Amino acid sequence: VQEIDLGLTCDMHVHVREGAMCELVTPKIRDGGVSIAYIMPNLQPPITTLDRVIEYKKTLQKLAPKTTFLMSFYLSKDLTPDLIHEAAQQHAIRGVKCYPAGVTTNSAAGVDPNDFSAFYPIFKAMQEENLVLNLHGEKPSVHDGDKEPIHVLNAEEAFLPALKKLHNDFPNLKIILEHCTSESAIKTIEDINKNVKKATDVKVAATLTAHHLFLTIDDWAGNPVNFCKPVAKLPNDKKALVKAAVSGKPYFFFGSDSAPHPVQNKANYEGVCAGVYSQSFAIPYIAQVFEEQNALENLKGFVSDFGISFYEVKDSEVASSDKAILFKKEQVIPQVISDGKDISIIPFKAGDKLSWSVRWEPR
Amino acid sequence: VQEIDLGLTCDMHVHVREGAMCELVTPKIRDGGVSIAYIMPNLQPPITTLDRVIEYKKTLQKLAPKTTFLMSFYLSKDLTPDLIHEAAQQHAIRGVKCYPAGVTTNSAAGVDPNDFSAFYPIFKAMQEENLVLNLHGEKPSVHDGDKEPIHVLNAEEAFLPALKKLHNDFPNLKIILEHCTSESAIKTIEDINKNVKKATDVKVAATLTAHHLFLTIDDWAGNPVNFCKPVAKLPNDKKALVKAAVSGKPYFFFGSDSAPHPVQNKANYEGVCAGVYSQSFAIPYIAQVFEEQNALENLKGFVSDFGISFYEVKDSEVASSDKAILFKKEQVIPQVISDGKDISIIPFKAGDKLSWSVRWEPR
Ligand SMILES: [Zn+2]
Ligand SMILES: [Zn+2]
Ligand SMILES: [Zn+2]
Ligand SMILES: [Zn+2]
């Protein structure tokens, strides 16, 4: 087309950090074409208290009055079932996010995905409250010499039995395999949802980032800016991710995992911080893929309908009724995104032409 | 043991660069325990002329009077059969190194490995002069949308048909698949050498680096200091390289691919230079592998006997008869190696303890 009404757009995997970085990035949610954002909890320290999660959103809302913020707790032994019920009651959180220990940013204070039993009381409460369980689905890497090797290329596949058990022990709970990167994970999600037909049946879904629809291992091998977790994988994996994203199936929907880092935390000779920054042009990135796939008819489901449906986003929570309007005027992605002070971020696909822009119209 | 006499040690894959970097690194050849070095030609601009290869060697000999230097040309369209004959007849080179275009440091002037026949007059002259054809055996990446894609993980496997065709078309030409990184390559070299046992029968050999005996993809994913070409691959590949290095087979011998870069060329958000710096502790790094594999009796073959046999190094070429003595004194690898002025290099396994040290015995 040349103008597409995406309605209330949906980015269900957002990192905005804190401090000067957050002031720079949260207004970019709306700027990249996103009305509703699900905010991830891996701050330093993690978000595990009620007052933190409440004030964090107030800080966010002040920065972005027209952005709807859905919040989350960082899965943790700190949490209690009481904190869960007390938070779902006051509608302070809409889900809880699990980070396996060591596999990504600010995950050191994370959990071990081999003994999930210690958190079954937490999922117990979460299920009763219809809260979402978000999973960074990678097993930690394993050296040893006895048990089968786990590395960055198969850590997501090795996590897939854990996902299935969690689904089989909490069958009413809403679970999301965040940012899928492998054909194996796509196939697992499609099998778990084999008998779904419309749509509110889905209880296990997967988010797909913008960058994993573009990247393979070649793009990050000598390019830390394209390094994130889970890493982009083989060409066959990308094909499956793209096919899923444009499939029109209600169990795949957009989650950017926009993960902002100052440029000096990417230009390291060791300990490069994982993460791609896509917030500034979130929807235009996804538009490009759907255009090239001749499937622009499925864009609205992927970037709006399916996440709204799965998260059950009701009209009474949306901060602004403005519609996101995609229109086919080319823009150039800048080389850097700066706050004029101490923050420079390199955006995903810095310097590239995008065919689409996005603006806001009232309902 | 305590103390092992390795004799005249060989590193048949050495980068020493130019200028201040070369003044820092070439004395480290001896320091890391290596008597004989095969000097790669991927300078800027590459070594493709007789005068430059002779002048380079003089520089190197002045920096390191006890080190034996074997030189090479960079395979390029500027080379002619007359020049091959002239360089051979002047004892100015021992081989010619092929870089497929785009796959590694200073390879933009390299070749198209789907059009090797354009270089058959060169190989013919090399065969007649008993020179060595060294191959950086990786196919350039093709992501394509046509036939099966090439990426950094399979680029070496994708190159193996070209190696077999070269050996089949020039059966008397000595060919080295440099720095093997994949089990598939190991199997291909073993199969080409099916009916060899000792040693002058070997026509196609492979070098193995120090770092590929330690590294997997998990070690460089977020660590540019460990990023090299060909990239370190899966646990199963590393296992097969280690087993090859301690094999005692005459068609595997040591080539460090020590590839020094200043620290600022590693700490980049894009365009990280490929290369691991291992020269300063080359022999001790290998000793650690052979000790852990209960294979110390095979060490002298892998790091001395087999390279000398394959390159036919004669006692009249040797710059010093000093013998390398490995002795089991602990040492720690520094965090950084500097010339005191503008160059800092991060060495392989910076900060780790090694069990062995190497010294020189005059003979
Ligand atoms: Zn994640
Ligand atoms: Zn994330
Ligand atoms: Zn190479
Ligand atoms: Zn090399």
UniProtKB/Swiss-Prot annotation, chains A, B:
How is the cofactor bound, as the UniProt entry phrases it? Answer: Binds 2 Zn(2+) ions per subunit.
Instruction: Please tell me one Gene Ontology term that the record gives under cellular component.
Output: nucleus
Keywords in alphabetical order = Hydrolase, Metal-binding, Pyrimidine biosynthesis, Zinc
Q: According to its UniProt record, what is one Pfam family this protein matches?
A: Amidohydro_2
Describe what upregulates or represses it.
By N-carbamoyl-L-aspartate.
The modified positions for N6-carboxylysine read 97
GO MF terms listed in the record are: dihydroorotase activity; metal ion binding
Coiled coil location: none
State the needed cofactors, names only: Zn(2+)
Q: Which PROSITE patterns match?
A: DIHYDROOROTASE_1, DIHYDROOROTASE_2
Family according to the record = Belongs to the metallo-dependent hydrolases superfamily. DHOase family. Class II DHOase subfamily.
Q: What else is known?
A: Present with 12700 molecules/cell in log phase SD medium.
Q: What is this protein called?
A: Dihydroorotase
Record organism: Saccharomyces cerevisiae (strain ATCC 204508 / S288c)
